[PDB]
Design an enzyme around this catalytic site. Structure first.
Site: not given
Ligand SMILES: Cc1ncc(COP(=O)(O)O)c(CNC2=CCCC(C(=O)O)=C2)c1O
Ligand SMILES: Cc1ncc(COP(=O)(O)O)c(CNC2=CCCC(C(=O)O)=C2)c1O
Lengths: 404, 404
Positions: B142, B228, B257
């Site tokens: 993801f 990532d 994040k």
């Molecule tokens: C491992 C990893 N890579 C990329 C992203 C994308 O980050 P964004 O800032 O959402 O574009 C994620 C995202 N993971 C998420 C954490 C919290 C909430 C969320 C959602 O509601 O879509 C996604 C990631 O984990």
């Protein structure tokens, strides 16, 4: 001592990617229409971060909203509800008269959301077969830097060397109703995304009646009309939305940039239930999208635009700016264009003198702007500027232009 | 009076898109490890916004940095230099020992930037013909919700009905070195992007030696190893980066994040000059990327993780959490896994009792979590939690699980 402007340039070159070539100025303070560099020099901001600080830099009411909310709660993720999002959703959907909003963070994210809505609506409502949905764009469009956004660009600097590209994106000329009619003969077209005025292309203003004609053609062929108002919206052109000039109601409206007054990355996708609800729970989102801090900022940012009547100010003052700019000699200024306080002039480039040199000398004389696509200088000051302040800026422009 | 939790749910359903199904709780305050709903009830946050508030909610030092900078300058656009960006670029590149950083806002934007870097490097340095560059991903990955990000997903809820899809993305099983070796026989592969621990998939921890084997295979075939670390980085797993457990240095590192402690959307792309400088000025960027307010927040956020030794706390406390969770009955809890304070349990779903019901009852008992992919409950509290507070939370988990 503190770092000088040259130290600041030198440090970014060493430790940051080389994906921009900014104008040589190093800012450390902003308030309203003014910016100050690290040497203490004061400048008129005639870019407004390309219309992200419509409300002026560091507007006290938007600043107050950020400071108040940051002591309470800033992010839960959409795993839970926060108490602010729905208050902002109700506020913004009433204001623009769409049934629902989908919150995101950056302009390109709103654009990507719009394309996902269009395809899902095309497949599940219009009946297009998977995966033949097409989205049409206008030459000169800019909506961001993802792989999808550059896939629709006609600017080779955006897409060259970054492929292979997203399929299903067709391109037609801007400001061209016969071309849109011809393109919409394809029953697999789901949407046409267009800027009411093209910003990055150089404030390209389409002819009167174009947006009316786009609305009619999209309806007649049941195609979704996506209006990208991320740079033109929020009073910059003299109305709440640039499409208001022609009394046109798009199917999807994108907002961003000034949606926060520059204090937070907040973007929005507005549309009615028949489009919005083709995306079901679990199928789209964002970590920071809809967080309560950005929502408090955006409510305050939207209230500033309405309560301070910035659209009518942008209208009246834009008329003054363009009329004064048209007094410049044709040998130097080839064109003046714009609506409201989104304007641009075109500089007759020679072997030597060009728009970059003009902007360097504008900077020397206390006004900050920058060229786009070589010969086009955008003039876009914050909408809180007053007539006296605008005329002082025009004299700086006159002094600079008439000094070559 | 104020809105109740049900009013808050009702309002979002009316005015906001239906792209999420959050757990039924309406938060209005956060501080450290705790959240409070609009009824005044206090909860342990065992999601940390999926590791965006590693530093705890509303950490005073990060809050102080935001309040201080917001009075000075928040956004100039990258049309000009601001005085903060280079100070943050120098700080973050020294900390992780890469030569350059490219600043963006959201996690997916950092991922998109990484794919653009990989393709441009593949075409201009490796010699792949345009446009045959391939990027390999692991099943279960993801990295966001753009059209490109869903094009590499193996989750049909992410991509079904949103095509046609971005070409050039191949998928192999996670935690599978023979599969990566086989995939890398293709000389047109430019990069392999992988999470050191897969978050959204359910805290899928690869076997010891996997990351070492990925590094060796990528080097041997000169493919870019993109790690990532948007969810695993920044002390959550017990080291600065999850790849530190195997002493592995990827070619591109993505952060996000918790890069801001939850106060601002800030993401980062870290790599050396040989990759970073294939993108030339004018070829990539973002409105809000690198703005001075986000930069002040991220500096403070990174300083909190280092000065409060949150990685070693996450390590020690993660050992306690997993050992206590493994005492739960096998008839109910089928698996416990994780590193540091990124952990998950798997619930033996029946016709009736499932992970959603467990989370509803966890909520009733004062602890907030949520299931992913049906039967997997993530346990990820802020890294500032203390051992006594962690054990009180474990007893809530025990009371809940042993109540069915
Ligand atoms: C491992 C990893 N890579 C990329 C992203 C994308 O980050 P964004 O800032 O959402 O574009 C994620 C995202 N993971 C998420 C954490 C919290 C909430 C969320 C959602 O509601 O879509 C996604 C990631 O984990
Ligand atoms: C008309 C229009 N649509 C979308 C976007 C993308 O917004 P982002 O927030 O950048 O993703 C834009 C962006 N226009 C820009 C304004 C300021 C700076 C900037 C850049 O440096 O890339 C782009 C837009 O105009």
């Amino acid at each position: 001592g503190p770092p000088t402007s040259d130290d600041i340039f030198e440090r970014e070159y060493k430790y940051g990617a080389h994906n921009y070539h900014p104008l040589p100025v190093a800012l450390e303070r902003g308030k309203g229409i003014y910016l100050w560099d690290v040497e203490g020099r004061k400048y008129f901001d005639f870019l407004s971060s390309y219309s992200a600080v419509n409300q002026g830099h560091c507007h006290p009411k938007i600043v107050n909203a950020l400071k108040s909310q940051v002591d309470k709660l800033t992010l839960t993720s959409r795993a839970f509800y926060n108490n602010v999002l729905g208050e902002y959703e109700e506020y913004i959907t009433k204001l623009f008269n769409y049934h629902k909003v989908l919150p995101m963070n950056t302009g390109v994210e709103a654009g990507e959301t719009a394309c996902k809505l269009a395809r899902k609506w095309g497949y599940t409502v219009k009946g297009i077969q998977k995966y033949k949905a097409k989205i049409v764009f206008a030459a000169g469009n800019f909506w961001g830097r993802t792989l999808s956004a550059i896939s629709s660009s006609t600017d080779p600097t955006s897409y060259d060397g970054f492929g292979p590209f997203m399929p299903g994106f067709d391109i037609i000329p801007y400001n061209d109703l016969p071309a849109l009619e011809r393109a919409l003969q394809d029953p697999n077209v789901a949407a046409f995304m267009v800027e009411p005025i093209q910003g990055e292309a150089g404030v390209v203003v389409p002819d009167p009646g174009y947006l009316m004609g786009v609305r009619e053609l999209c309806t007649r062929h049941q195609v979704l009309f996506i209006a990208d108002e991320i740079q033109t919206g929020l009073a910059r052109t003299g109305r709440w939305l640039a499409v208001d000039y022609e009394n046109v109601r798009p199917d999807i409206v994108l907002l961003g940039k000034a949606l926060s007054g520059g204090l937070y990355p907040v973007s929005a996708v507005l549309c009615d239930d028949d489009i919005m609800l083709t995306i079901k729970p679990g199928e789209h989102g964002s970590t920071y999208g809809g967080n309560p801090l950005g929502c408090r900022v955006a409510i305050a940012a939207l209230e500033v635009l309405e309560e301070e009547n910035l659209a009518e100010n942008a209208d009246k003052l834009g008329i003054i700016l363009r009329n004064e700019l048209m007094k410049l000699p044709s040998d130097v200024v080839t064109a003046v264009r714009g609506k409201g306080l989104l304007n641009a002039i075109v500089i007759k480039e020679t072997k030597d003198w060009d728009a970059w040199k003009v902007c360097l000398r504008l900077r020397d004389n206390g006004l900050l702007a920058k060229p786009t696509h070589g010969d086009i200088i955008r003039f876009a000051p914050p909408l809180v500027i007053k007539e006296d302040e605008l005329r002082e800026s025009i004299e700086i422009i006159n002094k600079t232009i008439l000094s070559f």
